[PDB]
Design an enzyme around this catalytic site. Structure first.
Site: not given
Length: 177
Positions: A72, A127, A145, A168, A171
């Protein structure tokens, strides 16, 4: 023997007609829809995949451990959890909208073939997986998630998702296994 490979060439994925559940193939780069397997398709592998697909509730197949693997590209923002990253060690202040516009541009370049998600993730993903081509490895349901899991398990191997928003940040996912 059991495999999650669709046998389709890069950029292609599986879709199901809205009525009568007939499967067809979609090229995410050209938006071409084809009922016939595109050139370069491994016919045997695809047929085997489609057979299980229709018996798996018309959902993508998972591996022998019940997992899927994805890479991702994450763009964090000031209203997401842990607003800091290797490339912004002192904190991320960009807004949600700013992160979305940035990612939208990345998505267009990925789908057009100008660049691979793994390459962009290397310098652009907030990330820790950026130095692993964005790879998060294999995971089971209940580990990631909810919105991310939903997207991930609904992708066929080789497919790229649209923008997914989680706690977060935002993405783009590419299923690799």
């Amino acid at each position: 023997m059991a495999s999650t490979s669709t046998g389709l060439p890069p950029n292609w994925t599986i879709r199901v007609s809205r009525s009568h559940n007939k499967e067809y193939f979609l090229n995410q780069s050209t938006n071409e829809s084809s009922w016939d397997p595109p050139y370069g398709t491994d016919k045997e592998v695809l047929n085997a995949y489609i057979a299980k697909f229709k018996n798996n509730g018309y959902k993508p197949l998972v591996n022998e451990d019940g997992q899927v693997r994805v890479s991702h590209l994450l763009i964090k923002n000031n209203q997401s959890r842990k607003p800091k990253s290797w490339k912004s060690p002192d904190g991320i202040s960009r807004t949600r909208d700013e992160s979305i516009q940035i990612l939208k541009k990345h998505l267009e370049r990925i789908l057009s073939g100008e660049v691979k998600l793994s390459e962009l993730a290397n310098t652009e993903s907030d990330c820790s997986s950026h130095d692993r081509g964005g790879d998060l490895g294999f995971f089971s349901k209940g580990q990631m998630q909810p919105p991310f899991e939903e997207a991930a398990f609904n992708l066929h191997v080789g497919e790229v998702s649209n923008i997914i928003e989680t706690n977060s940040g935002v993405h783009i996912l590419q299923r690799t296994g």
